[PDB]
Structures are given as C-alpha cells and as structure tokens.
Design a protein around this ligand. Structure first.
Ligand SMILES: Cc1cc2nc3c(=O)[nH]c(=O)nc-3n(C[C@H](O)[C@H](O)[C@H](O)COP(=O)(O)OP(=O)(O)OC[C@H]3O[C@@H](n4cnc5c(N)ncnc54)[C@H](O)[C@@H]3O)c2cc1C
Ligand SMILES: Cc1cc2nc3c(=O)[nH]c(=O)nc-3n(C[C@H](O)[C@H](O)[C@H](O)COP(=O)(O)O)c2cc1C
Ligand SMILES: Nc1ncnc2c1ncn2[C@@H]1O[C@H](CO)[C@@H](O)[C@H]1OP(=O)(O)O
Length: 612
C-alpha cells in the first residue's frame, strides 16, 4: 500500500503550451530508465522536434487519448521491471492499462524495456506496455526494445536508439538538424548557512530536524549501535550491523529490505576537485534553463560541489556513453577527444574500447580523468552530467518480533583490484564498514516492504536456502520461529541450508545458529563447506541429499521454499535441483517438474531474495 500523489494537469496540454511533440515517460527505481528517458527527450531536439521526460506517477495516462491533438506527436516509454512487476512509480499506469477501455486511436508509441535475463519474468513490464497500448488502439512506431542488464544495457540502448530516430524521422518526414546545457550555474557569495544543503535528500535540514513518517524522500538517521566482523580470515570482510530505529515509528517484518543513503570516499571526491583544479567548497546552484520543468535542479541546491560529489552524485560506476560523449569537448589532446567521442558507437573499435577500457576495467570518472589527462571539464558541467547516487538495499537480518526497534544488516565489504589498475571500493559497504558505534554514527535509511515472508501459519514447514550473505533474512526468520515456539505456538519444521567456504573461516552467525539448533528452533542446520574437501560441496548438494524428506515437506506438508543470495548461478542451480527432486518423486518428466516448481512460485510457496 502507498498513498497516491496529486496528479499534475494533463501532460498533453503542457506539451501544447511548451511546443513539445514527444514525451518520454520513465518507469524507474534505480534511476536508469530516468536517464534513458532524459537522453531520448534530449535527442528529439537534434531532429527538429522537441521533447520532455516525465514521471508517469505524476500524471493521468488516460490523457494519451488527447495526444493526437498535437501534430506528429509521439510517446515513448522507458520501463524497467522489478520482481516481475512495474516499478513503484509505474504501478498506477499499470493498473490503469489493465482496467481502462479508452480508445487510443491515433496515438503513436514506442517502448524500451529495462530488464535482466537472469530473472524469471524478463522485461515483463516493457513487454506488457508495448502489447497493451496496441490492444487499446495505438500504433507502434518502432519495435519493442529489450534491454538486458545481464549483458550490457547501455549497448542495447545505443543500438535501439540508433535505429529508433531514423525510423521516427522517416515516418514523420522530419530530418536531422552542438553541446547544450540543461542547467545554468549560479554561484552564491555571502549566502547564509541555513539555506545550503549538506547531504539531506528532501527538505532543507530534514536530516537535522527529523519528522516522521520516514521514507525514501525523508530517511531516518539510524544510530549504528553495533558493527562487528563476522568472518575469521583476512581474505574478505563480512560484517553485521545493528541500526537503532527507536522513535522512528518505522515498522518492518523479516523479509523486508532496508535501504541506506551512503557517502562517497572523501579522498575520491578531493582528488576529482584537485585534478580539475576546482574549488569544491564553492556554494552554488544548477538551475534548469527550462523554467517550465518541475525539475529545478539536478540535485538539492544550493550546495557545494564537495557536498554534491559526496552525497548526491555517483562517481564510482563506469560512466555511460553520453557522459563521455559530452565530456569529449573538454579533452585538448585530439586522440583523447576522439576516443571519448567514439565511446557512443554502436559497433567497431569505438564500442570495443568502451566495453573493455571503461566497463570491463571498471574505470570510474576519476580514473578516466587520470588516464586521459587532457580531459579537463568545468566542475559544474561534470556535476550536471553525473548520475544520482542511489541508495543501497540490504535484506533485514532481524525479526521485528524480537527487535522492533533495531534493523540488522549482514553484508560483505566490496573491495577489489580492477583491470583499470586501481583498487575499487564499494560505496555503501566501505561507508558502513567505517561507521563506529558511539559522536553518534548515523545511517540515513528507510524500509521497503517485500513479499518475502514467513508462512502465515506457524505450523507450515519452512525450507531456507541462503549461502554466504544469503543467510541474512533467515537470521530474522529463525529468530521469529524461535520466538513463536517460546510463545507457546506450534511450529512446523524449520530447515536451514547454508553454505560457506570453511567452518573456521567464514561461517557466519556460527554461535547463534548452533544455539537455535540446540534449542530446537532449527529442525536442521545443514551447512555446505565448499572448500573443506577437493570437491565443491554446495547447498544444492545437500538438498539433493535430503530429496526424499524435502519432497514430503513440499508435497504433503505445504512447505514454503526460500532462496536468498547469488541470483547468477546459485539460485538457478538450486532451482534445477528442486526440478530434479520433484521429477523423481512426483514422479514426472522434467518439463512437468519445471511447471510444478514455477507454480509453487505463483502460489506463494517458493520465494526469492536474490541479487547480483
Ligand atoms: C534486494 C537486494 C537485496 C540485497 N541484499 C544484500 C544483503 O543483504 N547483503 C549484501 O551484502 N548485499 C545485498 N545486496 C547488494 C547491495 O544492495 C549492494 O549492491 C552491495 O552491498 C554493494 O554495494 P556497494 O555500494 O558497497 O558497492 P557499489 O559501489 O555499489 O559497487 C557494486 C558493483 O561493483 C562491481 N563489482 C563488485 N565486485 C567486483 C569485482 N570483483 N570485479 C568487477 N566488478 C565488481 C559490480 O558492478 C557491482 O555491481 C542486495 C541487493 C539487492 C538488490
Ligand atoms: C531486486 C531486483 C529485482 C529485479 N527483478 C527483475 C525482473 O523480474 N525482471 C527483469 O527483466 N529485470 C529485473 N531486474 C533488473 C532491472 O529491471 C534492470 O536492472 C533495470 O535496468 C533497472 O532500472 P532502473 O534503474 O531504471 O529501475 C531487477 C533488479 C533488482 C535490483
Ligand atoms: N553455484 C553455487 N551454488 C551454490 N553455492 C555456491 C555456488 N557457487 C559458489 N557457491 C558457494 O557459496 C558460498 C558463499 O559464497 C561459498 O561456499 C561458495 O563456494 P566457493 O566460493 O568455494 O565456490
């Protein structure tokens, strides 16, 4: 559930007033689709047209029926998919699409879906919108784009976009017409301190003066009460943090996710300013040159560049091609300007260089500024080009039944040697690792309700599979199932299938799990130590070992299956093992076993909390 915002007045009438003929809506949750929509809206101008981006949530898409009132009009949808559903901001549009009977005759559209092939329902939202608009009477002007974040989404967009525009120009009889700034810089001298943002996300001083309810736009600064290392070795750093949410009025259940707004590495920020020869402490504002847009700034303003680079901008992920394309003008060495220019190529050496030199090598903006030393853009323009710093999600590792005023986190710190030649540090995990309990160590956060939940009936059996940090939500599940037993409730079997390299090196929550097992909260504690023998022993091997009993729990006990952790290979391997279990004991042919397992998913008996 989520209260709906007050809609803006019809977007078509706004297009008429502003001379726009193309509008690109974005269904986005991590800002990717938003960037893609903005890029397409900007492209229009280079083809003799004029566009605008827009959040579908702020509008009534029913006005699409009025779009034909504008000559040679066109609407484009850049939609990402999440858990097989629309992004939060596109749920309204989705619901309307299903219930409406409105006739969209005359409407011209195009859709670029953002997805990831490793998920069950790949690009489910983009596919639905593309098909539904046509059923409603609209006509497709260009083929559905299927972006796959498992390969390279940026390239899928480049390829689609390169074909899209010629198609649009050809159909509407328009033609291809210099760098253009979206914002203008306004430096502020003598400005009061009370009016300068310092990292807050919503209203000025919202971090200092905390007022509920707390959410993505108004995060609660939670005190880190505990932050300890969970593993023994020095190979990696796995940690457990406990955030105090007392007096926040925030509610949560095991299975939910906790999001945090981190701060970038200050040395990284410092170095960017230094290499550009810029004063990061200048207070300024970037104001939209289009006084009509509601998006007055790229991020909270006024503020210093240092604050923007630290809290509002992404300065670690590989820059996307349009950014490097716009920065090329600032490279005084011809050969460097040429490389940056060609990064936007849909094929050839330009594309190959971008994929290996920028993406594979994981070069962040500073690395590029260092490796292409002639590249010296003005700081204000770079800040306008960089993407927004996103919050990071973690599977809450505690049960609100046991810890109603504390939200636990289990994570592995990200730190690796990149082919770019430097050690790359994970933004959120490096920041979290540094938070020391007791001044207060505060973490801006909020909770996102998920559908990953323990069975309603205490008696229903639970099968938990979560190797490595995948154990996170299960520490919450187990705490809760233990609590239910302590409260006199009858609890069905609770089985954990966990995995790590070695018992004495990275066996997370070893002591806590042993106790739950001893007390009976855990009916079985099955642990696969992948490196204690020559052969790899994984959780799926244990599931295969216990195939007969698991089938009993699944077929006779109505047991619920839960998988958390690596979605790339572990999740699939585990799924395939369940297919094999069902096939042997049904019995039934593979094809039928697959349908059976996918059916458990729809019936809410096989849930996933997987990530990359
Ligand atoms: C719903 C959901 C639940 C999650 N739950 C948890 C959880 O409970 N515990 C947990 O630990 N994580 C979990 N995560 C992952 C978490 O959100 C972050 O992505 C993770 O903590 C890293 O964030 P960061 O800011 O530290 O690193 P970032 O700065 O975001 O960097 C991450 C990127 O670094 C790159 N990278 C990482 N290692 C390498 C490498 N070795 N070589 C090349 N590239 C690499 C990859 O592109 C990776 O995407 C979850 C993610 C989702 C979506
Ligand atoms: C928790 C999570 C769940 C996802 N579920 C799906 C999914 O079901 N189907 C799909 O095609 N892509 C899925 N994706 C991939 C996103 O759709 C893809 O990364 C998209 O580029 C994100 O766009 P955004 O930044 O505009 O929200 C998922 C990503 C995350 C992080
Ligand atoms: N494909 C897979 N299926 C199940 N577990 C896997 C897996 N790949 C790696 N693991 C194991 O997941 C645990 C947490 O990372 C480790 O024991 C790791 O073992 P490995 O690293 O020795 O391969």
């Amino acid at each position: 559930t989520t209260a709906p915002p007050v809609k803006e007045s019809s977007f078509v009438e706004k297009m008429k007033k502003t001379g726009r003929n193309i509008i690109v809506f974005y269904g986005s949750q991590t800002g990717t689709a938003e960037e893609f929509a903005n890029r397409l809206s900007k492209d229009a101008h280079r083809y003799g047209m004029r566009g605008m981006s827009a959040d579908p949530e702020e509008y009534d898409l029913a006005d699409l029926s009025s779009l034909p009132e504008i000559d040679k009009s066109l609407v484009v949808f850049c939609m990402a998919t999440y858990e097989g559903d629309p992004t939060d901001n596109a749920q309204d549009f989705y619901d309307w699409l299903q219930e409406t009977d409105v006739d969209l005759t005359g409407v011209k559209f195009a859709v670029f879906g953002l997805g990831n092939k490793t998920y069950e329902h790949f690009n489910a939202m983009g596919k639905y919108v593309d098909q539904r608009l046509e059923q409603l009477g609209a006509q497709r002007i260009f083929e559905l784009g299927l972006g796959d974040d498992d390969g390279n989404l940026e390239e899928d967009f480049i390829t689609w976009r390169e074909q899209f525009w010629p198609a649009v120009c050809e159909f509407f009889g328009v033609e291809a017409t210099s760098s253009i700034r979206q914002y203008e810089l306004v430096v502020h001298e003598d400005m009061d301190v009370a009016k300068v943002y310092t990292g807050e996300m919503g209203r000025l001083k919202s971090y200092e003066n905390q007022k509920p309810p707390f959410d993505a736009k108004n995060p609660f600064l939670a005190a880190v009460t505990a932050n300890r290392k969970l593993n023994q070795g020095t190979e990696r750093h796995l940690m457990h943090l406990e955030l105090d949410i007392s007096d926040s009025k925030i509610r949560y259940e095991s299975g939910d996710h906790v999001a945090v707004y981190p701060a970038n590495d200050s040395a990284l920020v410092n170095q960017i300013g230094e290499i550009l020869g810029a004063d990061l402490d200048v207070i300024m504002s970037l104001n939209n040159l289009d006084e009509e847009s509601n998006k007055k700034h790229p991020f909270p303003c006024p503020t210093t560049y240092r604050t923007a680079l630290t809290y509002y901008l992404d300065i670690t992920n590989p820059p996307r091609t349009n950014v490097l394309y716009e920065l090329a003008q600032y490279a005084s060495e011809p050969s460097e300007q040429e490389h940056l220019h060609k990064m936007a190529s849909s094929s050839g050496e330009g594309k190959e260089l971008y994929l290996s030199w920028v993406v594979e090598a994981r070069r962040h903006i500073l690395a590029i500024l260092q490796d292409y030393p002639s590249l010296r853009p003005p700081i204000d323009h770079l800040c306008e080009l960089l993407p927004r710093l996103q919050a990071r999600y973690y599977s809450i590792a505690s049960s609100s039944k046991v810890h109603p005023n504390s939200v636990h986190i289990c994570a592995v710190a990200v730190e690796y040697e990149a082919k770019s030649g430097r050690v790359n540090k994970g933004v959120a995990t490096s920041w979290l690792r540094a938070k020391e309990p007791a001044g207060r160590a505060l973490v801006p956060m909020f909770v996102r309700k998920s559908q990953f939940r323990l069975p309603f009936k205490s008696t229903t059996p639970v099968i938990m599979v979560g190797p490595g940090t995948g154990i996170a939500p299960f520490m919450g599940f187990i705490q809760e199932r233990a609590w239910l037993r302590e409260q006199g409730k009858e609890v069905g079997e609770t089985l954990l299938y966990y995995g790590c390299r070695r018992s004495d090196e990275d066996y997370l929550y070893r002591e806590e799990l042993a106790r739950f097992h001893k007390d009976g909260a855990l009916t079985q504690l099955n642990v696969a130590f992948s490196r204690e023998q020559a052969h790899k022993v994984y959780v799926q091997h244990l599931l295969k070992r216990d195939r007969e009993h698991l089938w009993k729990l699944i077929h006779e006990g109505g047991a619920h299956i839960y998988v958390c952790g690596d979605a790339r290979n572990m999740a699939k391997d585990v799924q395939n093992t369940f297919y094999d279990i069902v096939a042997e004991f049904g019995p039934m042919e593979h094809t039928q076993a697959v349908d059976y397992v996918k059916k458990l998913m729809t019936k809410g008996r096989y849930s996933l909390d997987v990530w990359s």
